[PDB]
Design an enzyme around this catalytic site. Structure first.
Site, PDB file in Angstrom:
ATOM      1  N   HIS A 144       0.849  -1.211   0.000  1.00 35.39           N
ATOM      2  CA  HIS A 144       0.000   0.000   0.000  1.00 35.39           C
ATOM      3  C   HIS A 144       0.887   1.265   0.000  1.00 35.39           C
ATOM      4  O   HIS A 144       1.895   1.341   0.689  1.00 35.39           O
ATOM      5  CB  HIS A 144      -0.934  -0.007   1.232  1.00 35.39           C
ATOM      6  CG  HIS A 144      -1.692   1.285   1.473  1.00 35.39           C
ATOM      7  ND1 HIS A 144      -2.617   1.794   0.576  1.00 35.39           N
ATOM      8  CD2 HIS A 144      -1.694   2.146   2.540  1.00 35.39           C
ATOM      9  CE1 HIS A 144      -3.119   2.930   1.064  1.00 35.39           C
ATOM     10  NE2 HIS A 144      -2.578   3.161   2.248  1.00 35.39           N
ATOM     11  N   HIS A 172       0.684   4.739   1.064  1.00 29.77           N
ATOM     12  CA  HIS A 172      -0.153   5.326   2.086  1.00 29.77           C
ATOM     13  C   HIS A 172      -0.402   6.816   1.877  1.00 29.77           C
ATOM     14  O   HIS A 172       0.534   7.635   1.883  1.00 29.77           O
ATOM     15  CB  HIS A 172       0.501   5.132   3.455  1.00 29.77           C
ATOM     16  CG  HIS A 172      -0.321   5.689   4.572  1.00 29.77           C
ATOM     17  ND1 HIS A 172      -0.797   4.910   5.601  1.00 29.77           N
ATOM     18  CD2 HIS A 172      -0.790   6.949   4.792  1.00 29.77           C
ATOM     19  CE1 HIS A 172      -1.507   5.667   6.426  1.00 29.77           C
ATOM     20  NE2 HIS A 172      -1.520   6.912   5.955  1.00 29.77           N
ATOM     21  N   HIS A 194       4.176   0.397   2.663  1.00 31.12           N
ATOM     22  CA  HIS A 194       4.287  -0.657   3.632  1.00 31.12           C
ATOM     23  C   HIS A 194       3.510  -1.886   3.170  1.00 31.12           C
ATOM     24  O   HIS A 194       2.497  -1.791   2.432  1.00 31.12           O
ATOM     25  CB  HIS A 194       3.824  -0.203   5.074  1.00 31.12           C
ATOM     26  CG  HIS A 194       2.395   0.299   5.188  1.00 31.12           C
ATOM     27  ND1 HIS A 194       1.306  -0.541   5.292  1.00 31.12           N
ATOM     28  CD2 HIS A 194       1.891   1.560   5.319  1.00 31.12           C
ATOM     29  CE1 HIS A 194       0.196   0.172   5.459  1.00 31.12           C
ATOM     30  NE2 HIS A 194       0.517   1.458   5.485  1.00 31.12           N
ATOM     31  N   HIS A 203       0.664  -4.468   3.203  1.00 27.90           N
ATOM     32  CA  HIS A 203      -0.724  -4.382   3.720  1.00 27.90           C
ATOM     33  C   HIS A 203      -1.296  -5.809   3.710  1.00 27.90           C
ATOM     34  O   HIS A 203      -2.458  -6.011   3.330  1.00 27.90           O
ATOM     35  CB  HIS A 203      -1.638  -3.341   2.967  1.00 27.90           C
ATOM     36  CG  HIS A 203      -2.607  -2.558   3.866  1.00 27.90           C
ATOM     37  ND1 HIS A 203      -3.533  -3.166   4.691  1.00 27.90           N
ATOM     38  CD2 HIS A 203      -2.786  -1.214   4.043  1.00 27.90           C
ATOM     39  CE1 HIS A 203      -4.199  -2.235   5.367  1.00 27.90           C
ATOM     40  NE2 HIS A 203      -3.780  -1.040   4.985  1.00 27.90           N
ATOM     41  N   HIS A 261      -6.280   4.946  19.674  1.00 26.32           N
ATOM     42  CA  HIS A 261      -6.262   4.234  18.389  1.00 26.32           C
ATOM     43  C   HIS A 261      -6.198   5.248  17.277  1.00 26.32           C
ATOM     44  O   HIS A 261      -7.100   6.089  17.121  1.00 26.32           O
ATOM     45  CB  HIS A 261      -7.485   3.323  18.259  1.00 26.32           C
ATOM     46  CG  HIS A 261      -7.624   2.356  19.402  1.00 26.32           C
ATOM     47  ND1 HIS A 261      -6.951   1.141  19.440  1.00 26.32           N
ATOM     48  CD2 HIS A 261      -8.389   2.403  20.521  1.00 26.32           C
ATOM     49  CE1 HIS A 261      -7.284   0.495  20.543  1.00 26.32           C
ATOM     50  NE2 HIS A 261      -8.158   1.236  21.215  1.00 26.32           N
ATOM     51  N   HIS A 309      -7.232   5.377  10.143  1.00 27.77           N
ATOM     52  CA  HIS A 309      -6.784   5.770   8.823  1.00 27.77           C
ATOM     53  C   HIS A 309      -7.889   5.423   7.847  1.00 27.77           C
ATOM     54  O   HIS A 309      -8.436   4.262   7.866  1.00 27.77           O
ATOM     55  CB  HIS A 309      -5.518   4.992   8.466  1.00 27.77           C
ATOM     56  CG  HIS A 309      -5.042   5.388   7.092  1.00 27.77           C
ATOM     57  ND1 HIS A 309      -5.005   6.710   6.693  1.00 27.77           N
ATOM     58  CD2 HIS A 309      -4.695   4.667   6.002  1.00 27.77           C
ATOM     59  CE1 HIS A 309      -4.630   6.788   5.425  1.00 27.77           C
ATOM     60  NE2 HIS A 309      -4.413   5.564   4.989  1.00 27.77           N
ATOM     61  N   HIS A 357      -8.508   4.991   3.830  1.00 32.27           N
ATOM     62  CA  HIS A 357      -7.882   4.914   2.490  1.00 32.27           C
ATOM     63  C   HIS A 357      -8.646   5.785   1.457  1.00 32.27           C
ATOM     64  O   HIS A 357      -9.854   6.102   1.666  1.00 32.27           O
ATOM     65  CB  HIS A 357      -7.807   3.433   2.002  1.00 32.27           C
ATOM     66  CG  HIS A 357      -6.821   2.587   2.769  1.00 32.27           C
ATOM     67  ND1 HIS A 357      -5.871   1.801   2.152  1.00 32.27           N
ATOM     68  CD2 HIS A 357      -6.638   2.412   4.100  1.00 32.27           C
ATOM     69  CE1 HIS A 357      -5.150   1.161   3.062  1.00 32.27           C
ATOM     70  NE2 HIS A 357      -5.600   1.514   4.260  1.00 32.27           N
ATOM     71  N   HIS A 385      -9.580   1.669   9.167  1.00 35.01           N
ATOM     72  CA  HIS A 385      -9.077   0.757  10.202  1.00 35.01           C
ATOM     73  C   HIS A 385      -8.129   1.452  11.193  1.00 35.01           C
ATOM     74  O   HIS A 385      -7.547   2.513  10.878  1.00 35.01           O
ATOM     75  CB  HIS A 385      -8.359  -0.442   9.526  1.00 35.01           C
ATOM     76  CG  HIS A 385      -7.077  -0.086   8.828  1.00 35.01           C
ATOM     77  ND1 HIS A 385      -5.874   0.066   9.497  1.00 35.01           N
ATOM     78  CD2 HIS A 385      -6.809   0.147   7.519  1.00 35.01           C
ATOM     79  CE1 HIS A 385      -4.927   0.381   8.622  1.00 35.01           C
ATOM     80  NE2 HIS A 385      -5.464   0.436   7.411  1.00 35.01           N
ATOM     81  N   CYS A 386      -7.938   0.836  12.369  1.00 37.98           N
ATOM     82  CA  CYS A 386      -6.920   1.279  13.328  1.00 37.98           C
ATOM     83  C   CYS A 386      -5.567   0.983  12.753  1.00 37.98           C
ATOM     84  O   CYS A 386      -5.344  -0.157  12.344  1.00 37.98           O
ATOM     85  CB  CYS A 386      -7.021   0.526  14.658  1.00 37.98           C
ATOM     86  SG  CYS A 386      -5.738   1.215  15.764  1.00 37.98           S
ATOM     87  N   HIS A 387      -4.657   1.984  12.699  1.00 35.92           N
ATOM     88  CA  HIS A 387      -3.305   1.770  12.106  1.00 35.92           C
ATOM     89  C   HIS A 387      -2.307   1.147  13.112  1.00 35.92           C
ATOM     90  O   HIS A 387      -1.135   1.037  12.811  1.00 35.92           O
ATOM     91  CB  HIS A 387      -2.698   3.053  11.426  1.00 35.92           C
ATOM     92  CG  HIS A 387      -1.911   2.786  10.151  1.00 35.92           C
ATOM     93  ND1 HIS A 387      -0.704   2.091  10.126  1.00 35.92           N
ATOM     94  CD2 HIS A 387      -2.151   3.143   8.852  1.00 35.92           C
ATOM     95  CE1 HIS A 387      -0.243   2.025   8.883  1.00 35.92           C
ATOM     96  NE2 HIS A 387      -1.107   2.645   8.085  1.00 35.92           N
ATOM     97  N   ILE A 388      -2.757   0.705  14.280  1.00 39.07           N
ATOM     98  CA  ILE A 388      -1.930  -0.200  15.116  1.00 39.07           C
ATOM     99  C   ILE A 388      -2.088  -1.603  14.513  1.00 39.07           C
ATOM    100  O   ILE A 388      -3.179  -2.233  14.589  1.00 39.07           O
ATOM    101  CB  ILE A 388      -2.317  -0.145  16.623  1.00 39.07           C
ATOM    102  CG1 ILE A 388      -1.990   1.260  17.180  1.00 39.07           C
ATOM    103  CG2 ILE A 388      -1.624  -1.250  17.456  1.00 39.07           C
ATOM    104  CD1 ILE A 388      -2.561   1.514  18.566  1.00 39.07           C
ATOM    105  N   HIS A 397      -3.836  -4.451  16.202  1.00 36.41           N
ATOM    106  CA  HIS A 397      -5.303  -4.223  16.283  1.00 36.41           C
ATOM    107  C   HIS A 397      -5.987  -4.606  14.954  1.00 36.41           C
ATOM    108  O   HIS A 397      -7.002  -5.324  14.942  1.00 36.41           O
ATOM    109  CB  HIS A 397      -5.644  -2.784  16.781  1.00 36.41           C
ATOM    110  CG  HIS A 397      -5.066  -2.488  18.132  1.00 36.41           C
ATOM    111  ND1 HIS A 397      -5.120  -1.235  18.707  1.00 36.41           N
ATOM    112  CD2 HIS A 397      -4.358  -3.273  18.999  1.00 36.41           C
ATOM    113  CE1 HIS A 397      -4.497  -1.260  19.885  1.00 36.41           C
ATOM    114  NE2 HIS A 397      -4.044  -2.485  20.096  1.00 36.41           N
ATOM    115  N   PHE A 451      -9.805  -4.955  13.832  1.00 38.68           N
ATOM    116  CA  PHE A 451     -10.308  -3.577  14.081  1.00 38.68           C
ATOM    117  C   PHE A 451     -10.405  -2.775  12.773  1.00 38.68           C
ATOM    118  O   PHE A 451      -9.567  -1.887  12.490  1.00 38.68           O
ATOM    119  CB  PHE A 451      -9.411  -2.889  15.120  1.00 38.68           C
ATOM    120  CG  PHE A 451     -10.125  -1.919  16.034  1.00 38.68           C
ATOM    121  CD1 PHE A 451     -11.513  -1.933  16.188  1.00 38.68           C
ATOM    122  CD2 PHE A 451      -9.381  -1.023  16.805  1.00 38.68           C
ATOM    123  CE1 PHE A 451     -12.149  -1.055  17.055  1.00 38.68           C
ATOM    124  CE2 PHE A 451     -10.010  -0.116  17.638  1.00 38.68           C
ATOM    125  CZ  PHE A 451     -11.395  -0.128  17.756  1.00 38.68           C
TER     126      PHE A 451
HETATM  127 CU   LIG Z   1      -5.981   0.338  17.836  1.00 35.68          CU
HETATM  128 CU   LIG Z   2      -0.696   3.001   6.146  1.00 27.15          CU
HETATM  129 CU   LIG Z   3      -3.568   4.165   3.586  1.00 28.96          CU
HETATM  130 CU   LIG Z   4      -4.451   0.724   5.681  1.00 26.12          CU
END
Ligand SMILES: [Cu+2]
Ligand SMILES: [Cu+2]
Ligand SMILES: [Cu+2]
Ligand SMILES: [Cu+2]
Ligand SMILES: *[C@@H]1O[C@H](CO)[C@@H](O[C@@H]2O[C@H](CO)[C@@H](O[C@@H]3O[C@H](CO[C@H]4O[C@H](CO)[C@@H](O)[C@H](O)[C@@H]4O)[C@@H](O)[C@H](O[C@H]4O[C@H](CO)[C@@H](O)[C@H](O)[C@@H]4O)[C@@H]3O)[C@H](O)[C@H]2NC(C)=O)[C@H](O)[C@H]1NC(C)=O
Ligand SMILES: *[C@@H]1O[C@H](CO)[C@@H](O[C@@H]2O[C@H](CO)[C@@H](O[C@@H]3O[C@H](CO)[C@@H](O)[C@H](O)[C@@H]3O)[C@H](O)[C@H]2NC(C)=O)[C@H](O)[C@H]1NC(C)=O
Ligand SMILES: *[C@@H]1O[C@H](CO)[C@@H](O)[C@H](O)[C@H]1NC(C)=O
Ligand SMILES: *[C@@H]1O[C@H](CO)[C@@H](O)[C@H](O)[C@H]1NC(C)=O
Ligand SMILES: *[C@@H]1O[C@H](CO)[C@@H](O)[C@H](O)[C@H]1NC(C)=O
Ligand code: NA
Ligand code: NA
Length: 499
Positions: free
Chosen positions: A64, A66, A109, A111, A395, A398, A400, A452-455, A458, A463
């Protein structure tokens, strides 16, 4: 810097960014990966070559980019089982897209599952030859990119499900763990009298970082990929996957100054030079700084950021003044996260492939209870109320496919419908603050987009949901190349151990 046309070869290799040796996923031989760069209007052709051999860290992969809108190229966005099937080991895939209308600081990164934690991540910059801030600095190049990353001695699939922080914070690829405080630190060079555009990118899988440089104030000019009014601060709390550009005026005495990035948990503080790098003026000796941290009296607050050019918030200026209002209710049961009662599980057929094959309604799209069908050319408001029901706060969420307006920030009880910042990753704050972080965007980008949560742990715990935007036009707006249609048959034909 490679790009805008380039091969990125993915392999497993031994590395030791803090002096401890471990197997990792690397890009063109290194982790973090090399800087990918181009200029606004370029066409990017990034040929991703999968030569992975190690199943524990996954032999498939998917990348991805980002922050990029991917208008008309939803197939190239990256998320596994949302926008494509994974690339299989020994295959390559050409991500071919354009950036007609964005410039700024981005990153890339894996995905696929939690593979980016094991090393597949690096920074990505799109320069603007007419940047409206160009007159505030003299240097902006490869040496002004600063990356932060959490580093673990045990691989993502081999340690706890939810790690209690990292062994080391790395700044431009290097840093110390408490077990070896003599490992080599990163040095960033400046020349006294010149001004620098520093491009700070969080490559983190989890911890947020509190970033500061001894003896220097920072002038914020960019938030994620959005130009801001200049904001002078003396520290910056930056959440996983966020970015800022700040100007630093190198006008202090010729010397070595500590650069600090303190994680919210794990090994905190600075004993022995952990969580640190070195700002070195030309001329200063090659040694460690002995400077002292002073109390931040001008920390960044998100409600103080405003866009450089006036940009109206979507919708009418009152609560629910939009075409579609969605509230995200969080829960957690010890091993899995839920959003409005559903924990995300990737479908067999990627969401995009379901749509191309005719699926257009919430009723037809899988996974049931996790896909939201949004009307086209409409204003959307999403709120993420903080709750004790979701441990591991704050949290950072993000979206997309989109930049959004932050109408209500963490740590603030005010709604701003007038001039809030737009960005693409936002802390959802904590229940102790009574937070209800709230965002708005317009739907002018047909495609299924991840939210989604970017942790990453998670995310692996489920998540996440999907925004299926303007489904009647997705097929017409995003024609797909044959190499994309071939991903799923090759991937699904693999032995499980070769995933
Ligand atoms: Cu989270
Ligand atoms: Cu990202
Ligand atoms: Cu993204
Ligand atoms: Cu993402
Ligand atoms: C975090 O922020 C979110 C997003 O705002 C809050 O959720 C909204 O919260 C309020 C609850 O106060 C809801 O508002 C009420 O909506 C009723 C109609 O709701 C239906 O229709 C709307 C519009 O179509 C849909 O969004 C919604 O899903 C429902 O189907 C109105 O009847 C209410 O008006 C009545 O009460 C008010 C308030 O006292 C009176 O002033 C009026 O005169 C009237 O009698 C009211 O406006 C809203 O529906 C929620 N939005 C959602 C779910 O999207 C969160 O509660 C907040 N969470 C926390 C912890 O702070
Ligand atoms: C494929 O990638 C994985 C993940 O990085 C590599 O796993 C590494 O596996 C070794 C061998 O088991 C681990 O070492 C062992 O650690 C345990 C637990 O502390 C200890 O009891 C053993 O005596 C031994 O040292 C190693 O930590 C692990 N690496 C990571 C980062 O978790 C694996 O080696 C790779 N395969 C190949 C063929 O390279
Ligand atoms: C930075 O800001 C502080 C607080 O505003 C100010 O007093 C200080 O002199 C500035 N520091 C430098 C090095 O300019
Ligand atoms: C948590 O929820 C998930 C998804 O519904 C379920 O599969 C898992 O077994 C549950 N875990 C616990 C500890 O209940
Ligand atoms: C929808 O599309 C029109 C036509 O191009 C555009 O001008 C407008 O800003 C959009 N409105 C929303 C709510 O997306
Ligand atoms: Na920008
Ligand atoms: Na001192």
């Amino acid at each position: 810097a490679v790009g805008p046309v380039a091969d990125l070869t993915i392999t497993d290799a031994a590395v030791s960014p803090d002096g401890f040796s471990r197997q990792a996923v690397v890009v063109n031989g290194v982790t973090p990966g090399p800087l990918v760069a181009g200029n606004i209007g370029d066409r990017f052709q990034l040929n991703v070559i999968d030569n992975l051999t190690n199943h524990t860290m996954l032999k498939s992969t998917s990348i991805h980019w980002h922050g990029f809108f991917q208008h008309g190229t939803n197939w190239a966005d990256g998320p596994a089982f949302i926008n494509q099937c994974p690339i299989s080991p020994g295959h390559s895939f050409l991500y071919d897209f354009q950036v007609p209308d964005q410039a700024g600081t981005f990153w890339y990164h894996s995905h696929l599952s939690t593979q980016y934690c094991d090393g597949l991540r690096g920074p990505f910059v799109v320069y603007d030859p007419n940047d409206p801030h160009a007159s505030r600095y003299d240097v902006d190049n490869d040496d002004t990119v600063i990356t932060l990353a959490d580093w673990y001695h045990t691989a993502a699939k081999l340690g706890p499900r939810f790690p209690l922080g990292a062994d080391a914070t790395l700044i431009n690829g290097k840093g110390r763990a408490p077990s070896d405080t003599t490992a080599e630190l990163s040095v960033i060079k400046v020349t006294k009298g010149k001004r620098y555009r520093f491009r700070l990118v969080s490559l983190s899988c989890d911890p947020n970082h509190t970033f500061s440089i001894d003896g220097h104030n920072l002038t914020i000019i960019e938030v994620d990929s959005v130009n801001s009014q200049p904001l002078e601060v003396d520290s910056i709390q930056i959440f996983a996957a966020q970015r800022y550009s700040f100007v630093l005026d190198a006008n202090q005495a010729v010397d070595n100054y500590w650069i600090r990035a303190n994680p919210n948990f794990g090994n905190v503080g600075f004993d022995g030079g952990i969580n640190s790098a070195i700002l070195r003026y030309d001329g200063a000796p090659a040694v460690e700084p002995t400077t002292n941290q002073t109390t931040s009296v001008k920390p960044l607050n998100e409600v103080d950021l405003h866009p450089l050019v006036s940009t109206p918030v979507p919708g009418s200026p009152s609560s629910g003044g939009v075409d579609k209002a969605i509230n995200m209710a969080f829960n957690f049961n010890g091993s899995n996260f839920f959003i409005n009662g559903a924990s995300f599980v990737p479908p067999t057929v990627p969401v995009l492939l379901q749509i191309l094959s005719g699926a257009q309604t919430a009723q037809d799209l899988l996974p049931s209870g996790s896909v939201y069908v949004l009307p086209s050319n409409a204003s959307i408001e999403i709120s993420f109320p903080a709750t004790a029901a979701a441990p591991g706060a704050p949290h950072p969420f993000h979206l997309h496919g989109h930049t959004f307006a932050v109408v209500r920030s963490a740590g603030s009880t005010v709604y701003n419908y007038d001039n809030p910042i737009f960005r693409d990753v936002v802390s959802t704050g904590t229940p102790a603050a009574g937070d209800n972080v709230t965002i708005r965007f317009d739907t002018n980008n047909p495609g299924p987009w991840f939210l989604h949560c970017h942790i990453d742990f998670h995310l692996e715990g489920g998540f996440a949901v999907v925004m299926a935007e303007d489904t009647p036009d997705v097929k017409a707006v995003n024609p797909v190349p044959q190499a994309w249609s071939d991903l799923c048959p090759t991937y699904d034909a693999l032995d499980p151990n070769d995933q």
